[PDB]
Design an enzyme around this catalytic site. Structure first.
Site, short mmCIF file in Angstrom:
data_model
loop_
_atom_site.label_atom_id
_atom_site.label_comp_id
_atom_site.label_asym_id
_atom_site.label_seq_id
_atom_site.Cartn_x
_atom_site.Cartn_y
_atom_site.Cartn_z
N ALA A 12 0.80 -1.32 0.02
CA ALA A 12 0.03 0.05 0.17
C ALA A 12 0.82 1.34 -0.03
CB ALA A 12 -0.99 0.00 1.19
N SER A 140 -0.04 0.84 5.19
CA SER A 140 -1.52 0.06 5.51
C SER A 140 -1.32 -0.32 6.91
CB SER A 140 -1.63 -1.07 4.60
OG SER A 140 -0.77 -2.22 5.03
N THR A 145 3.64 -6.27 6.73
CA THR A 145 4.70 -5.19 6.87
C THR A 145 4.30 -3.61 7.00
OG1 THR A 145 5.89 -6.39 4.97
CG2 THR A 145 6.37 -4.41 5.32
N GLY A 146 3.24 -3.39 6.47
CA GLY A 146 2.71 -2.24 6.55
C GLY A 146 2.51 -1.70 8.05
N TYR A 224 -7.07 -0.42 -7.06
CA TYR A 224 -6.12 0.37 -6.22
C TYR A 224 -5.41 1.56 -7.05
CZ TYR A 224 -5.85 -3.44 -2.79
OH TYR A 224 -5.82 -4.24 -1.56
N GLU A 254 2.65 24.71 10.88
CA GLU A 254 2.04 25.73 11.33
C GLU A 254 0.40 25.27 11.60
OE1 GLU A 254 2.89 29.91 10.43
OE2 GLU A 254 0.78 30.23 10.10
N1 LIG Z 1 -5.44 2.62 -0.66
C1 LIG Z 1 -4.57 1.46 -1.01
N2 LIG Z 1 -4.81 0.25 -0.14
C2 LIG Z 1 -3.93 -0.82 -0.31
C3 LIG Z 1 -3.22 -0.75 -1.63
N3 LIG Z 1 -2.50 -1.95 -1.63
C4 LIG Z 1 -2.90 -2.73 -0.41
N4 LIG Z 1 -3.67 -2.11 0.46
C5 LIG Z 1 -4.50 -2.41 1.52
O1 LIG Z 1 -3.38 -2.62 2.66
C6 LIG Z 1 -3.85 -3.61 3.22
C7 LIG Z 1 -3.15 -4.98 3.01
O2 LIG Z 1 -1.66 -4.61 3.35
P1 LIG Z 1 -0.55 -4.58 2.24
O3 LIG Z 1 0.09 -3.11 2.19
O4 LIG Z 1 -1.24 -5.07 0.96
O5 LIG Z 1 0.39 -5.74 3.06
P2 LIG Z 1 1.97 -5.44 3.34
O6 LIG Z 1 2.30 -4.25 3.75
O7 LIG Z 1 2.83 -5.60 1.99
O8 LIG Z 1 2.39 -6.61 4.25
P3 LIG Z 1 2.59 -8.09 3.68
O9 LIG Z 1 2.23 -8.21 2.36
O10 LIG Z 1 1.61 -9.00 4.88
O11 LIG Z 1 4.13 -8.47 4.07
C8 LIG Z 1 -5.28 -4.07 2.74
O12 LIG Z 1 -6.21 -3.43 3.63
C9 LIG Z 1 -5.34 -3.43 1.34
O13 LIG Z 1 -6.71 -3.04 1.05
C10 LIG Z 1 -3.09 0.39 -2.47
O14 LIG Z 1 -2.28 0.23 -3.45
N5 LIG Z 1 -3.90 1.37 -2.09
#
Ligand SMILES: Nc1nc2c(ncn2[C@@H]2O[C@H](COP(=O)(O)OP(=O)(O)OP(=O)(O)O)[C@@H](O)[C@H]2O)c(=O)[nH]1
Ligand SMILES: *[C@H]1[C@@H](C)[C@H]2[C@@H]([C@H](O)[C@H]3[C@H]4[C@H]([C@H](OC(C)=O)[C@H](OC(C)=O)[C@@]32C)[C@]2(C)[C@H](C[C@@H]3O[C@@H]3[C@@H]2OC(C)=O)C(=O)[C@@H]4O)[C@]2(C)[C@@]1(O)OC(=O)[C@@]2(C)O
Ligand SMILES: Nc1nc2c(ncn2[C@@H]2O[C@H](COP(=O)(O)OP(=O)(O)OP(=O)(O)O)[C@@H](O)[C@H]2O)c(=O)[nH]1
Ligand SMILES: [Ca+2]
Ligand SMILES: [Mg+2]
Ligand SMILES: [Mg+2]
Lengths: 440, 67, 431
Positions: A12, A140, A145-146, A224, A254
């Protein structure tokens, strides 16, 4: 100086990063190879866009950014894509095995193997700054990871850079595009762990964006790509204050002064307008008054919640394009008399306004109409706690049965971490309740 | 007043340092506790499998002592 | 990439195993020589998940072929795509286990197992990042059941942090009259509940019932049963083999499907299932397709999901179709069948859409359910097990190999615990 370093974590974070930096390049007239013909100072400079772009002696304008993912396939698309020449290979960092939607693997098992390298690459960027302001972290809530790696990184950044400002753009989960049942766990865990290490966090509710794409852009089933292009416009609005100069262009720092009354209360609600298709924008001028009014329509919010049933602690309006103060003041006057805008009794009711004259930009092949003026409202409202309430309830449903908890325990985590995280969230909901109560 | 001014900035420095210090220690503690836990879980898994190996030897031994 | 190592043990294992490779090779544009003759880049994007690359741009299945019966070695090799497999990956004994689980698990199979591990180790060591293993086998025989579960334990010992997935064919009197199969199945389940991360319950009872009632085949051959299995196996591995968002690897699937470690036995399902007469998808709509995959008649395990509740569900739609319509219909099913999904796991049904349809169908739906109703499968086996064990019938087959009757008691008890655990969470409420 006042450089800003962006860190894009997980799918994400990375994919939103792609959309943001593409947009930035188009806004500043930077080519995919990094060349910027209008920039006459070769190899350096202290222009406003240099807060986000460094410069090489060969005239390349390079994003002050690091991309990190624990698997390679998303960042590999950056490495081979349109803007591959934009980034130095060392800015794009990948492992071979992702966190499998498990916070534990992102923060511990897998994350620990790459954290030192990531910090070294960030240090490389920081050492090229003459007056580093802080970091912007894209990620995310729901991914392994997020969630897991981001929180590890935020902890380590607080150690290596002290109280240096750290801002988040956090993607809040929605069932329409979520990819894991345990995303409520990961969300609560990262929010707890990151809370003390973040100065300000802009939550982006994927369902809100999804709804906006469906209703305002007539996109039947948003991808996405659809979501991210909209999100990038909002991020651009927020960072435009840093990347452009102008007499009326108020700096983000600010706005932050007004937006954060207590350290834990650092989650602004973003509302953006106009979001309109080309078909409908044709022969349709949206005035300052019209786009400003749209900021108080909850359907245009980045997070699903109802400010009309909460209390405001701050209201900021970030205009860009064909906008002058006279029209803003008239627009606000009207709104003051008609809308449901109740402030807590301990903060002033005045709206803080910034104006950037550079007009809104759109990416080719996009869904958004190119407009002459746009606005992003940043409000501090008790209503945003609704988002916490919904997540915490989902968390409670599963955790009462310890569903999926063995996946986290198997990676070395303890149940005490879950209850500790949940307790912090309960305290946070309580905090938002308390700030809304009238004074003695 | 000068004395107060010194004490304010000193306090600012100390609070910042204490924040960094405690963040560093809490993280070190978490990573260690986590590694111990994971190692123990894997160790307990392998021990269960080693017990299966032990049982299999006993089954094959049992066969010999019946013929 | 993220490599998967495939193992197939015994007759059943090798039969459905070979069909699996035939089907996905066609999908990926791989011919029986190993050369790519397809057109779409999507076919090669994640090819390395199941295929090794070799000299002359050849694609070789990361497959290991095992049996105590030396004959099956030739059966595979003579079949279509039999030549594609790596010669050194054939591992063979000199005589079958004669439907004796003890022989496969403790004696003759235990004598062969190190030879199999050497091949596993060779394949694994050449992996960029091995994600785990995939075993095809029956639980009714002696080798696939007995030696297969031995293999799992030995692999787990050397690869304790990788995912172990099985496609386990459950015995049915409607297909095989061998009387000891309930013993072998119970002894196997005893192993699987402890040592696998995820198990697809391919029930011969269900495969027969589908062929006989729905597809109106008077006499179903193993080839016809295996067509259902191969179509299912193609479906449930689609997310592993083609670019996508949902359950793209073995661990992510497990994390989405398994809320409790022991409860990892899935009900697979497939749609459409229709005779050549009437519909062959002549306007089988997304709504109709969706309702069918959630019906008892379309499950590859002989269980009625409406006799229990879903803990988790994965649904994979394949072919050109409206994603908006799929989304709407999946919401509709959950709305109208809300009672059959546990309330204390929010959003527990995940949906994927893959543009690539299977051979001979314009659109299809594959179903993976973790339902508490799977207890009906284990209860069936348990009933048959008891009928034998009360008389200690044929028990000398197993004690003769050195087993104690106590192990029979423990296996029976562990499978009974599994049933009551599935019942526990079936009865659980949010409040
Ligand atoms: N807005 C948006 N949300 C995203 C996108 N890609 C993934 N998500 C959201 O992120 C969440 C899943 O996390 P990811 O970022 O895909 O997973 P990661 O951070 O790569 O972590 P892992 O794959 O488990 O190692 C879900 O809620 C998805 O809907 C994107 O490109 N845009
Ligand atoms: C058994 C015979 C029943 C098998 C036959 C074909 O390979 C199978 C085709 C399959 C048929 O399904 C029907 C018509 O009900 C049927 O498979 C069954 C009943 O299990 C056939 C004739 C087809 C036609 C499938 C294409 C399309 O998806 C429709 C249908 O499959 C289903 C589940 O409806 C095929 O392409 C299959 O070729 C044989 C040869 C059989 O005679 O012995 C086999 O080994 C077999 C299954 O391959
Ligand atoms: N669906 C399906 N089931 C099969 C097939 N072949 C055998 N079976 C079932 O598997 C069970 C017997 O196991 P087998 O695989 O034949 O035996 P094995 O694994 O080779 O072990 P041994 O022959 O004892 O050495 C019976 O219940 C059969 O109905 C097949 O090709 N397809
Ligand atoms: Ca310059
Ligand atoms: Mg990822
Ligand atoms: Mg055999």
């Amino acid at each position: 100086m006042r450089e800003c370093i962006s860190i894009h974590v997980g799918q994400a974070g990375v994919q939103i990063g792609n959309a943001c930096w593409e947009l930035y390049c188009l806004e500043h007239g930077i080519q995919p190879d990094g060349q910027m013909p209008s920039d006459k100072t070769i190899g350096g400079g202290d222009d406003s866009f240099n807060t986000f772009f460094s410069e090489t002696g060969a005239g390349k304008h390079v994003p002050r950014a690091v991309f990190v993912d624990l698997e390679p396939t998303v960042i590999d698309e950056v490495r081979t894509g349109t803007y591959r020449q934009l980034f130095h290979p060392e800015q794009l960092i990948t492992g071979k095995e992702d966190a499998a939607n498990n916070y534990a693997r992102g923060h511990y098992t897998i994350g620990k193997e790459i954290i030192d390298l990531v910090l070294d690459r960030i240090r490389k960027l920081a050492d090229q700054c003459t007056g580093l302001q802080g970091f912007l972290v894209f990620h995310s809530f729901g991914g392994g990871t997020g969630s897991g790696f981001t929180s590890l990184l935020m902890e380590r950044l607080s150690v290596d850079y002290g109280k240096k400002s750290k801002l988040e753009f956090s993607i809040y989960p929605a069932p329409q595009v979520s990819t894991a049942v345990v995303e409520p766990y990961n969300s609560i865990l990262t929010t707890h762990t990151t809370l003390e290490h973040s100065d300000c966090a802009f939550m982006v509710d994927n369902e809100a964006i999804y709804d906006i794409c469906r209703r305002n852009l007539d996109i039947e089933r948003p991808t996405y790509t659809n979501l991210n292009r909209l999100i990038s416009q909002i991020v651009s609005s927020i960072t435009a204050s840093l990347r452009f100069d102008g007499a009326l262009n108020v700096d983000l720092t600010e706005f932050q002064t007004n937006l954060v009354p207590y350290p834990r209360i650092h989650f602004p609600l973003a509302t953006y307008a106009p979001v309109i298709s080309a078909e409908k924008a044709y022969h349709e001028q949206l005035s300052v008054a019209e786009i400003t009014n749209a900021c108080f329509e909850p359907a245009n919010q980045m997070v699903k919640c109802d400010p009309r049933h909460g209390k405001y602690m701050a209201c900021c309006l970030l205009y860009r394009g064909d906008v002058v103060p006279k029209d803003v003041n008239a627009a606000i006057a009207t709104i003051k008399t008609k809308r449901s805008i109740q402030f807590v009794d301990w903060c002033p009711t005045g709206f803080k306004v910034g104006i950037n004259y550079q007009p809104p930009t759109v990416v080719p092949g996009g869904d958004l109409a190119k407009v002459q003026r746009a606005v992003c409202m940043l409000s501090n409202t008790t209503a945003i706690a609704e988002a916490w309430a919904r997540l915490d309830h989902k968390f409670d449903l599963m955790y009462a049965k310890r569903a999926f908890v063995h996946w986290y325990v198997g990676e070395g985590m303890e149940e005490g971490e879950f209850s500790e995280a949940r307790e912090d969230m309960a305290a946070l909901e309580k905090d938002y309740e308390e700030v809304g109560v009238d004074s003695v | 007043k000068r004395e107060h001014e010194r004490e304010v900035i000193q306090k600012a420095i100390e609070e910042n340092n204490n924040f960094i210090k405690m963040a560093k220690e809490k993280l070190a503690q978490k990573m260690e506790s986590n590694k111990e836990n994971r190692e123990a879980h894997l160790a307990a898994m392998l021990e269960r499998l080693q017990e299966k190996d032990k049982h299999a030897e006993e089954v094959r031994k049992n066969k010999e002592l019946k013929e | 990439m993220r490599e998967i190592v495939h193992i197939q043990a015994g007759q059943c294992g090798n039969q459905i195993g070979a069909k699996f490779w035939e089907v996905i090779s066609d999908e990926h544009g791989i011919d029986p020589t190993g050369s790519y003759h397809g057109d779409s880049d999507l076919q090669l994007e994640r090819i390395n998940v199941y295929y090794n690359e070799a000299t002359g741009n050849k694609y070789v299945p990361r497959a290991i072929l095992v049996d105590l019966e030396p004959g099956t070695m030739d059966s595979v090799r003579s079949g279509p795509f039999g030549q594609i497999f790596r010669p050194d990956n054939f591992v063979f004994g000199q005589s079958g286990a004669g439907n004796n689980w003890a022989k496969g698990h403790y004696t003759e199979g235990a004598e062969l197992v190190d030879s199999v591990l050497d091949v596993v180790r060779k394949e694994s060591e050449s992996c960029d990042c091995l994600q785990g293993f995939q075993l095809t086998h029956s639980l009714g025989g002696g080798t696939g059941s007995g030696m297969g579960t031995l293999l799992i334990s030995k692999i787990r010992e050397e690869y304790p942090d990788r995912i172990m997935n099985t496609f386990s064919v459950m015995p049915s009197p409607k297909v095989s009259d061998t009387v000891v199969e309930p013993y072998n199945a119970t002894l196997s389940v005893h192993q699987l509940v402890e040592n696998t991360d995820e198990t697809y319950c391919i029930d011969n009872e269900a495969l027969y019932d589908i062929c006989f009632r729905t597809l109106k085949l008077t006499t179903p051959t193993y080839g016809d049963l295996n067509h259902l299995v191969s179509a299912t196996m193609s479906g449930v591995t689609t997310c592993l083999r083609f670019p996508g968002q949902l359950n793209a690897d073995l661990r992510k699937l497990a994390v989405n499907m398994v809320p409790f470690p022991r409860l990892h036995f899935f009900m697979p399902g497939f749609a459409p299932l229709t005779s050549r007469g009437s519909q062959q998808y002549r306007a089988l709509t997304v709504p109709e397709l969706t309702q069918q995959m959630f019906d008892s008649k379309n499950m590859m395990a002989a269980c009625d999901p409406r006799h229990g509740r879903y803990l988790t569900v994965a649904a994979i739609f394949r072919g050109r179709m409206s994603m908006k319509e799929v989304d709407e219909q999946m919401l509709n099913v959950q709305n109208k069948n809300s009672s059959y999904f546990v309330e204390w796991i929010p959003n527990n049904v995940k949906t994927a859409v893959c543009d690539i349809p299977p051979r001979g169908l314009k659109m299809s739906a594959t179903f993976i359910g973790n339902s508490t109703a799977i207890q009906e499968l284990f209860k069936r086996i348990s009933e048959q097990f008891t009928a034998m064990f009360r008389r200690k019938a044929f028990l000398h087959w197993y004690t003769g190999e050195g087993m104690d009757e106590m192990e029979f008691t423990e296996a029976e008890s562990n499978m009974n615990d599994l049933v009551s655990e599935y019942q526990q969470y079936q009865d659980a409420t949010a409040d």
